[PDB]
Scaffold this active site. Structure first.
Site, short mmCIF file in Angstrom:
data_model
loop_
_atom_site.label_atom_id
_atom_site.label_comp_id
_atom_site.label_asym_id
_atom_site.label_seq_id
_atom_site.Cartn_x
_atom_site.Cartn_y
_atom_site.Cartn_z
N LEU A 53 -1.52 39.84 80.48
CA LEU A 53 -0.76 39.22 79.41
C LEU A 53 -1.72 38.79 78.31
O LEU A 53 -2.90 39.16 78.29
CB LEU A 53 0.04 37.99 79.87
CG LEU A 53 1.37 38.07 80.61
CD1 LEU A 53 1.14 38.25 82.10
CD2 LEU A 53 2.23 36.84 80.33
N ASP A 54 -1.18 38.00 77.39
CA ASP A 54 -1.94 37.29 76.38
C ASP A 54 -2.30 35.91 76.92
O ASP A 54 -1.66 35.38 77.83
CB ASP A 54 -1.11 37.17 75.10
CG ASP A 54 -1.93 36.75 73.89
OD1 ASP A 54 -3.15 36.51 74.03
OD2 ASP A 54 -1.35 36.67 72.79
N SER A 55 -3.37 35.34 76.34
CA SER A 55 -3.75 33.98 76.68
C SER A 55 -2.70 32.97 76.23
O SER A 55 -2.50 31.95 76.90
CB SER A 55 -5.11 33.67 76.07
OG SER A 55 -5.05 33.69 74.65
N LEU A 56 -2.01 33.25 75.13
CA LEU A 56 -0.93 32.38 74.70
C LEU A 56 0.33 32.57 75.54
O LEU A 56 1.06 31.60 75.79
CB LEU A 56 -0.62 32.62 73.22
CG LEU A 56 0.44 31.73 72.56
CD1 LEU A 56 0.01 30.28 72.58
CD2 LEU A 56 0.70 32.19 71.15
#
Ligand SMILES: NC(=O)c1ccc[n+]([C@@H]2O[C@H](COP(=O)([O-])OP(=O)(O)OC[C@H]3O[C@@H](n4cnc5c(N)ncnc54)[C@H](OP(=O)(O)O)[C@@H]3O)[C@@H](O)[C@H]2O)c1
Ligand code: SF4
Lengths: 152, 111, 80, 306, 114, 208, 385
Positions: free
Chosen positions: C37-40
């Site tokens: 995923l994304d870190s956010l």
């Protein structure tokens, strides 16, 4: 028709006989209008009453210098006016924004926001050419309501 | 008098000994500081200069002369804060030498 | 009070999002070392428990879960 | 020739001329033309005050106002003698108490198919309608297709535009609905057979003109305006009362600006999804607008929050 | 660096702060869209929020991100209350602006290489 | 020399040479340069470690009252390797004396603000944040004063050009008053005015 | 709590100053106003101008003062240039510098008495105010905004007249100030409308950095008018008013006695003016006369160059302030060494005089708050500092 077009010499006379203006005091052109309210060049009772609530206006007056923090608030009051309205802006900073003209945060013109009809020039117009601008405005009303639906 | 001139204070209450405590209140705290800074050398100089003329002579009005403050109740406030001044002189250390000399050309004006 | 009760609630959070996960409702979707995923977007996964079943997420434990087992496990000691 | 950014106060080469331009369609088109910057020459008919809200779109020196009737010739010629392109959108609904209303779609597009064309203009564009057919319906709907052919003799290459029904803010067709606060809300006419036509959105209309105004090569190849997805249903009339939760007239009121219990009521319920071999909108791209997103804006009734 | 920081120390008091107020924006986007009486879809707002955070992800130095934290928090002061009268929130979306070409053959027909 | 030349005096030039001398003597921790102006003004150059206590020392005394905070300003100076320059100006009530406090800083390095020391710095201190970005420390309410809500510029520095980028206009495309890139009707013709030949002998530079 | 923003309302006064009110039912207890309606880009704008060319943008900084502004500028420049102004010129800067105080202290009461809502003292005094703008037009150039004070002293001499006019004017003015004494002082309702309102008297009334009235009339005797000289200004005799307590009604009664001082000073200044010159003679700053710039060779080269560029100012920072009729007037004029100045930061009143509205307001009504504002005499465009 001679019968019907006789009528608008009362109605288009009556609207140019009672104007209830709003003033937006923002800068040094506000102070000179107060001297027009002062009874030397007594602004009252030459057809036109003094201040009035924002609802009941016909002729709005922008005086002074507009900033970008006032450009939304100008349009909202301009919507709330009724239909046969007119905009007349005094002051040389309401015609191109005087100087301050090359500044980063002054509305350039007071014409790119509202449509304005009569342009009085000058850092302060001396409350001497401004009654002349108002008699220009009543001179501008030579319009007609009949022979508009009677033509088309 | 019932109004002290400068509005916001009240004549509260006694001259000549409310002061005389508060000078001596400072002088005992004054001895606590390590003596290498000249802060003691001038502050103890003017308090001993003051308290010698303070203690103890009539009247209130004569004590206004040779003690250049406002009215006598306000002369409390001239040294009221000074007690709060000198006790924080122990907390930070101004007697330490200079720190962070500027990088050798900064306070030259014409660019 | 059912420890199976918080098992169903957690395991339709992730696919209710129309993002990355292709029906991998497995307990080992290990969130940017397995799942990816994304870190956010990890923080947006934690978000849907305030409204579904009710949950606080007070502390740095949202930066600690990293697998849907531990999401159930952190609601396990929360509930029973 | 163009210069610099066309944000504002540019030149951009073109010099247009838009007649009518006081209604819902003709105003909103010009509000793009004063943004890229050009010499927009708009002559109005008989209305000094009704163009006051128009001026703050062109910056300074870009717009100009003139007077013209239309049955006169040189007033339609003196203005157009220095331009490059010219479009027209003039016309309205019901017959005036003084006019003729038939030749207004015949001789008035011909009055600017006069020396106007001979003067040296190009890319002259007229408007059509998707439903204007030569069939015996209606008194207003047909007699528009008469102008589509009898005036097509002049201007052998035009790319006359053909729009469908439009929806925007202040039109007549969508504001015909929800202005029906009455003792009965009946559809047209208690039947869900033909409803509805293709409501293209108004941004797509003004976007089609500005792409075609220097396209190039768009003369003669007439174009049609696609609507939304896809035909439409009877649900629209129920869609009104669900989400709504059930200009130079006169000094007091106009005596006759009615709902017109005449051939007005049938000019919209005659859908005619016409030939798809016209190119006509997606090739003049890009125009793609649904209905469900722009419906919050135009509808405005007493709840206003929920 | 002979300079004291603002809030963070090194990257770990930092990156937990940019995640932090993201939830405060995330419950705010559905909250204001019915408040300021404007009409778009709410998912466009959530796309534009993560649009802003992801673009500045090329920073490898503290107290600059922390400087954006003070900038990012001050945005919420007008936002939770009503201090942006229906214009400043619409200012985020370059809506009525004409599109930039951004293509070499497209730039070449219009402009003196802007 | 003549009439129409300002008559200077030496009495105030003496005591202000006298008073400010033993100021550096009793705090040689923060003071790095003191100078006397030729027209009875004083500068006390201070590294901003002692931003609070030196003010706190001038907050109260018996030989220096100085409780009238008049002027907080901000001056940028490029080509200094630490740009900005916070400059105070405070007034002794009982003594009729002016003295300024010149404290340099940089952009990212914060400054311990004077919030407990003075409560007239409530709106002055926020202004430097809005105009430069100098983040003062521990202020209870940092906000936006005297600028518009959407700026990102901090305009009073030198790289911000004369106009912005944000020339505003209205359209009737829907309702909005929309922003746009800036477009002028005239250049603001910039002149060239610096005459040569060096009218000043006294301020002559080191000739290198 | 109700969060009304009674401000942008064009309810007379000055339709501006939009603020918030977190009122606790009826009392306010929290006021956080917003400013910035006119920021105008002033302090950035001066960085491209020269000294003579930038000068009217000090004039348009008030609404009222025309010779008290530009008094704080030429005196902020002549110190840098080692010039004393010639002695005939100094008697005029005190004359018009003690005539603008008879414009603020008329406007500072009537406009306060209009927010309150009295009609007739607004029209009873501006009709007498017209007898005074004829002076401004006769001497300088216009109705109000006059680029009249220069750095080289006075622009030009006032013509024949204006000495049997001012003496004619000032001998019939104390009857008009005896009118408003009957209108407001002995009245009870206006006294009941303002007693014990805005009681700010402690040392935070000076830690907030206030200038005059909303000072000394509340207590602490200090002013810039006889502890710091300007020109020939100490050679006249007058006294300074002090009120009793620290409310608005004991800062109102400064302004009645303040106008009773400017009449004395004008009637003292006229007796003492000598004949002489106008400008500074050395002509590296003053332009030469018109009858001179058409004859000699030396006149044009020190005319034609003096308008292409300006003066030659030495470097080194400076600062001063004078008595604006509502406060101090700080100018920290940074000089660089050319015809164009560097940074020019101004301090105007209202920064202190309106940030301390937070302390002054609370514990009181909402109808109190409009009556607070017209006592400090706050003018916008002047809060653009
Ligand atoms: N695309 C669609 O869906 C649609 C729907 C209905 C109608 N139309 C037709 O397409 C155009 C759209 O017009 P609109 O929606 O903007 O409403 P509109 O008010 O009819 O605007 C068209 C302009 O034509 C003017 N006009 C009418 N008769 C005229 C005459 N003899 N001489 C000069 N001007 C005349 C009208 O008033 P003035 O005289 O004051 O200028 C009006 O300004 C019209 O031609 C209309 O008949 C299209
Ligand atoms: S320049 Fe003109 S509009 Fe601007 S403040 Fe002065 S008088 Fe008013």
């Amino acid at each position: 028709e001679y019968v019907v077009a006789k009528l608008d010499d009362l109605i288009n006379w009556a609207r140019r006989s009672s104007l209830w203006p709003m003033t937006f005091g923002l800068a040094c052109c506000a102070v000179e209008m107060m001297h027009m309210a002062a009874p030397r060049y007594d602004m009252d009772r030459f057809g036109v009453v003094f201040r009035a609530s924002p609802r009941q206006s016909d002729v709005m007056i922008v005086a002074g210098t507009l900033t970008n923090k006032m450009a939304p608030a100008l349009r909202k009051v301009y919507d709330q006016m009724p239909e046969p309205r007119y905009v007349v802006s005094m002051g040389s900073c309401a015609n191109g924004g005087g100087y301050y003209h090359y500044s980063y945060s002054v509305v350039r013109g007071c014409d790119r926001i509202v449509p304005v009809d009569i342009y009085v020039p000058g850092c302060p117009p001396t409350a001497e050419a401004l009654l002349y601008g108002i008699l220009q405005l009543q001179k501008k009303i030579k319009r007609e309501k009949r022979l508009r639906i009677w033509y088309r | 008098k019932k109004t002290t001139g400068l509005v916001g204070l009240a004549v509260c209450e006694t001259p000549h000994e409310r002061l005389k405590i508060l000078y001596t209140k400072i002088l005992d705290v004054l001895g606590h500081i390590p003596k290498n800074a000249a802060y003691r050398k001038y502050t103890e100089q003017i308090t001993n200069e003051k308290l010698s003329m303070v203690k103890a002579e009539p009247d209130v009005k004569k004590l206004e002369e040779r003690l250049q403050g406002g009215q006598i109740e306000e002369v409390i406030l001239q040294a009221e804060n000074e007690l709060s001044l000198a006790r924080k002189m122990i907390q930070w250390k101004p007697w330490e030498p200079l720190v962070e000399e500027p990088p050798a050309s900064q306070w030259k004006w014409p660019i | 009070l059912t420890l199976e009760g918080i098992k169903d609630r957690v395991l339709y959070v992730l696919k209710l999002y129309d993002k990355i996960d292709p029906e991998k409702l497995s307990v080992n979707s290990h969130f940017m070392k397995d799942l990816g995923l994304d870190s956010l977007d990890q923080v947006e996964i934690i978000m849907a428990m305030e409204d579904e079943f009710g949950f606080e997420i007070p502390d740095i434990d949202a930066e600690k879960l990293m697998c849907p087992q531990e999401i159930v496990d952190y609601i396990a000691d929360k509930k029973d | 020739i163009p210069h610099g950014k066309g944000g504002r106060s540019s030149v951009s080469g073109i010099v247009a001329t838009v007649f009518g331009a006081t209604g819902f369609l003709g105003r909103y088109v010009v509000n793009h033309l004063g943004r890229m910057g050009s010499q927009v020459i708009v002559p109005h008919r008989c209305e000094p005050y009704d163009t006051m809200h128009l001026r703050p779109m062109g910056d300074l020196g870009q717009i100009i106002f003139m007077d013209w009737n239309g049955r006169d010739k040189d007033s339609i010629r003196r203005a157009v003698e220095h331009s490059s392109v010219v479009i027209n959108l003039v016309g309205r609904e019901w017959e005036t108490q003084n006019f003729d209303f038939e030749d207004v779609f015949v001789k008035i597009p011909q009055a600017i198919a006069q020396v106007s064309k001979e003067a040296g203009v190009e890319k002259f564009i007229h408007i059509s309608h998707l439903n204007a057919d030569i069939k015996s319906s209606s008194k207003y709907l047909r007699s528009k297709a008469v102008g589509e052919k009898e005036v097509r003799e002049t201007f052998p290459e035009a790319t006359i535009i053909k729009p469908a029904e439009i929806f925007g803010r202040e039109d007549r067709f969508l504001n015909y609905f929800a202005n029906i606060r009455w003792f009965g809300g009946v559809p047209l006419i208690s039947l869900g057979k033909k409803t509805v036509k293709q409501p293209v959105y108004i941004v797509d209309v003004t976007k089609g003109i500005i792409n075609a105004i220097k396209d190039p090569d768009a003369r003669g190849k007439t174009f049609a305006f696609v609507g939304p997805s896809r035909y439409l249903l009877f649900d629209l009339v129920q869609y009104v009362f669900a989400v709504a939760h059930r200009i130079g007239r006169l000094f007091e009121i106009s005596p006759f600006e009615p709902w017109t219990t005449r051939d007005k009521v049938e000019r919209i319920h005659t859908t005619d999804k016409i030939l798809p071999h016209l190119p006509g909108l997606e090739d003049l791209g890009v125009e793609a607008t649904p209905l469900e997103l722009k419906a919050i804006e135009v509808l405005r009734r007493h709840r206003t929050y929920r | 660096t002979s300079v004291k920081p603002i809030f963070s120390r090194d990257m770990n008091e930092a990156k937990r702060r940019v995640r932090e107020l993201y939830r405060a924006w995330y419950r705010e986007v559905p909250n204001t869209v019915h408040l300021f009486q404007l009409d778009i879809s709410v998912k466009q707002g959530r796309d534009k929020v993560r649009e802003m955070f992801k673009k500045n992800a090329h920073i490898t130095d503290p107290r600059v991100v922390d400087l954006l934290v003070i900038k990012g928090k001050m945005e919420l002061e007008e936002t939770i209350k009503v201090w942006k009268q229906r214009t400043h929130v619409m200012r985020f979306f370059h809506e009525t602006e004409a599109p930039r070409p951004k293509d070499f053959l497209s730039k070449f027909y219009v402009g003196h290489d802007p | 020399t003549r009439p129409t030349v300002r008559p200077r005096n030496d009495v105030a030039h003496k005591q202000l040479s006298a008073f400010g001398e033993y100021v550096a003597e009793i705090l040689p921790k923060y003071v790095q340069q003191v100078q006397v102006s030729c027209f009875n003004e004083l500068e006390i150059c201070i590294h901003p470690d002692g931003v609070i206590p030196v003010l706190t020392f001038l907050r109260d005394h018996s030989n220096a009252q100085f409780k009238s905070l008049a002027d907080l300003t901000a001056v940028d100076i490029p080509t200094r390797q630490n740009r900005f320059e916070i400059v105070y100006n405070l007034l002794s009530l009982r003594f009729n004396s002016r003295i300024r406090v010149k404290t340099y800083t940089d952009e990212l390095t914060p400054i311990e603000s004077s919030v407990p020391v003075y409560k007239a710095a409530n709106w002055y201190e926020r202004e430097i944040w809005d105009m430069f970005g100098v983040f003062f420390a521990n202020h209870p309410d940092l906000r936006r004063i005297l600028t518009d809500y959407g700026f990102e510029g901090h305009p009073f520095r030198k790289d911000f050009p004369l106009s912005g980028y944000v020339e505003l206009r209205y359209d009737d495309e829907v309702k909005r008053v929309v922003a746009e890139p800036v477009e002028l009707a005239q250049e603001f013709r910039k002149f060239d005015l610096n005459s040569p030949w060096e009218a000043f002998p006294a301020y002559r530079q080191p000739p290198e | 709590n109700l969060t009304l923003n009674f401000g942008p309302q064009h309810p007379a006064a000055h339709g501006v100053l939009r603020l918030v009110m977190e009122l606790s039912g009826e009392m306010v207890r929290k006021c956080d106003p917003h400013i910035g309606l006119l920021h105008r880009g002033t302090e950035k704008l001066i960085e491209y101008k020269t000294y003579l060319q930038a000068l009217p943008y000090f004039d348009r900084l008030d609404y009222v003062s025309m010779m008290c502004n530009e008094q704080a500028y030429s005196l902020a420049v002549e110190k840098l240039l080692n010039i004393q102004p010639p002695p005939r010129a100094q008697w005029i800067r005190v004359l018009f510098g003690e005539i603008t105080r008879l414009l603020n202290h008329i406007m500072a009461v009537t406009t306060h008495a209009l927010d309150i809502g009295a009609m007739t003292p607004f029209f009873w005094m501006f009709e007498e105010r017209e007898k005074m703008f004829e002076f401004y037009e006769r001497v300088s150039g216009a109705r109000m905004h006059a680029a009249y004070v220069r750095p080289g002293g006075v622009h030009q001499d006032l013509p024949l007249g204006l000495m049997d006019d001012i003496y004619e004017f000032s001998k019939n003015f104390s009857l008009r100030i005896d009118e408003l004494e009957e209108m407001l002082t002995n009245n009870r309702i206006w006294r009941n409308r303002t007693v014990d309102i805005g009681i700010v008297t402690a040392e935070d009334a000076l830690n907030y950095g206030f200038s005059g009235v909303m000072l000394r009339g509340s207590g602490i005797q200090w002013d810039l008018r006889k502890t710091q000289p300007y020109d020939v200004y100490d050679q006249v005799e007058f006294d300074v008013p002090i009120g009793s307590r620290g409310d608005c009604y004991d800062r109102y009664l400064c302004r009645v006695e303040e106008m009773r001082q400017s009449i004395r000073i004008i009637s003292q200044c006229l007796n003492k003016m000598p004949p002489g010159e106008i400008k500074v003679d050395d002509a590296k700053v003053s332009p030469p006369k018109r009858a001179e710039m058409k004859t000699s060779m030396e006149s044009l080269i020190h005319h034609f160059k003096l308008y292409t560029e300006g003066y030659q100012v030495p470097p080194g920072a400076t600062y001063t302030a004078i008595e604006a009729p509502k406060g101090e007037f700080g100018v920290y004029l940074v000089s660089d060494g050319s015809s164009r100045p560097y940074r020019c930061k101004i301090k105007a009143p209202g920064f202190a005089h309106l940030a301390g509205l937070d302390k002054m307001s609370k514990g009181h009504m909402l109808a109190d708050v409009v009556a607070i504002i017209g006592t400090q005499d706050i003018v916008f465009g002047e809060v653009d500092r």
